[PDB]
Amino acid sequence: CVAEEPIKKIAIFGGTHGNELTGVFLVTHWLKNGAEVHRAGLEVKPFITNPRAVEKCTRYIDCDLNRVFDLENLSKEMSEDLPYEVRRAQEINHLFGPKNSDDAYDVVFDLHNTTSNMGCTLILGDSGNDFLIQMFHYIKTCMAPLPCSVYLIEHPSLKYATTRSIAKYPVGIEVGPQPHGVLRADILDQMRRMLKHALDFIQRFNEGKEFPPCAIDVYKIMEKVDYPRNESGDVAAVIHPNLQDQDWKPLHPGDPVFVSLDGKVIPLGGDCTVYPVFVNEAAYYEKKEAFAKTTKLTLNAKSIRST
Amino acid sequence: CVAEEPIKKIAIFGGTHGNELTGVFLVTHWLKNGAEVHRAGLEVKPFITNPRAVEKCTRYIDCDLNRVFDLENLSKEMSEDLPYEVRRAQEINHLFGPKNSDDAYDVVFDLHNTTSNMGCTLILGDSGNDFLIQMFHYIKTCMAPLPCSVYLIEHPSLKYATTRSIAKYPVGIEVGPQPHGVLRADILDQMRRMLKHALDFIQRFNEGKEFPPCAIDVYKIMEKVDYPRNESGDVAAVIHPNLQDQDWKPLHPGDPVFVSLDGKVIPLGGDCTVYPVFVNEAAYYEKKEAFAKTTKLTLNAKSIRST
Ligand SMILES: [Zn+2]
Ligand SMILES: [Zn+2]
């Protein structure tokens, strides 16, 4: 049984990307009216992380706020040509960190949307963290029969620079499909239910509930796949209609992945089954990612209890 | 029978809004590879109307290119204060107009995408235009039983400043739903099919096909409906899930239209059945349009032929 410290300070971040409206709308509402996110014994602080991008309804001002929380950026002196989001990341770190300190917030839920058909998605940064595996098992049980899928990042590069990484326990909450700059009522309902259960879990944990051992399936990112490109670097083929909206569904080497305007089909390739995620995300065209290949695995957590 | 001269000069505009990728991708392709839009006897010119917005994948740089083709803007003196899209509209007017001259292009197809669930949509500016009614009837007939809906936008305050308004016969071609900044294969195949039949119609008309009288159903704009807003001017309620994606379907006075986070449902109101269009289009939040109410009517066209 993993013995563990009670959680005291929780933040809920929305508008990390300024055009992802669900987190913006909920955090804006909870700042006005906090009853929904109140839990006995918890300090819960909703916060808009990129208000300048939110006011422009744009992903970012100068660079992605979700890529500048690495140590180098958090400790960088200001310079004239430095992206705005580096200065904003320091401001957020000053309020909710410092990152890697005992004073840092215990849990940060960073709220995101995607244009990909990923449904309710939890992002896990540590495959050995019993506390988070337990929380995610709890949320999934409460959301059932809506799928609630878990994306695991092991590589340090794709997690160490994220906004949620300031917390002792980072949690990414990702819900799609939703076009950026749109608020869909269904997506809002799904995200608010995920949060309701995550907060319930934390309060129960604090109150001394002992959670028995559990296991969850997770999809661990293997590598990004770019679009085929023309000499000039523009996209030469698009996501095949059979792959479009089929995030999480197994893809085999001969299955079609891209299609060109002439009707040429390009299949997955390789030697293994993969589970594609972020299929056709708008923000990722410039990041050279048509989708990411993942592998499925099981994580077990030991029982846990507050000390 | 209305006899008209053969159509000679046709333009196909893509990227009027730079983040609506279907027309950008198709036009970019046809500039290099024109066979798909070749027709015997026709001069077909693909053209990217807002190259700066396209390169930044954004709707516009300074102002909406689809709002600046009014004579005041087009006749504005060249200066350094001038919005980029004003300077660009004047270039387009010189190349494909001038608007209101006998030298203007005969047909301009302006290609758009929407995040609303509208399917294939043709935009008609003039309810008396026998040639356009016949073209649209042809396209609908050829696509049957696939959805192909016609939106009639007639008042001068609504039509006078559009990019396509330079042509003798302006045609808007609109296909959704597609997140902006995303290219879906399905949406691409729908828009290519509309255009194939539109160009086939023009060729047959020029070749002497005589078209008997026809009729089409259209949805004529009545008025825009904004989101309920707080004192601050931020959105206070979102599109109700029963209205979400239900473009074109009759909506009655007591049917739900918005829902707040606190759960208040706001009904249509008024005294008549309407047909909503552009339900939840991302670009329209700032235009104060949650959706447009329309009324359905039948338009007849005389027999037409080429002289
Ligand atoms: Zn995001
Ligand atoms: Zn448009």
From Swiss-Prot, chains A, B:
* One MF term in the entry's GO annotations: metal ion binding
Give the catalytic activity: an N-acyl-L-aspartate + H2O = a carboxylate + L-aspartate; N-acetyl-L-aspartate + H2O = L-aspartate + acetate
Q: Which residues bind Zn(2+)?
A: 17, 20, 112
Record bears the keyword Nucleus: yes
- Binding sites annotated in the UniProt record for N-acetyl-L-aspartate: 59, 66-67, 160, 164, 284
* InterPro entries membership: AspA/AstE_fam, Aspartoacylase, AstE_AspA_cat, Aste_AspA_hybrid_dom
Q: Which residues does the annotation list for site: Transition state stabilizer? A: 59
Cite the cofactor comment: Binds 1 zinc ion per subunit.
* GO CC term, one of those recorded: nucleus
Query: Which controlled-vocabulary keywords does the entry list?
Result: Cytoplasm, Hydrolase, Metal-binding, Nucleus, Zinc
Q: Where in the cell is it found?
A: Cytoplasm; Nucleus
- The active site is formed by 174
- Record EC number: 3.5.1.15
| Entry annotated with the keyword Signal | no
Superkingdom classification of source: Eukaryota
Pfam families found in the cross-reference section: AstE_AspA_cat (PF24827), AstE_AspA_hybrid (PF04952)
- Membership in a protein family: Belongs to the AspA/AstE family. Aspartoacylase subfamily.
What does the record give as the function of this protein? Catalyzes the deacetylation of N-acetylaspartic acid (NAA) to produce acetate and L-aspartate. NAA occurs in high concentration in brain and its hydrolysis NAA plays a significant part in the maintenance of intact white matter. In other tissues it acts as a scavenger of NAA from body fluids.
Q: How does it assemble?
A: Homodimer.
The record's listing under NCBIfam families reads:
PRK02259.1
This chain belongs to which protein, by name?
Aspartoacylase
Gene source species: Rattus norvegicus
Query: What gene makes this protein?
Result: Aspa
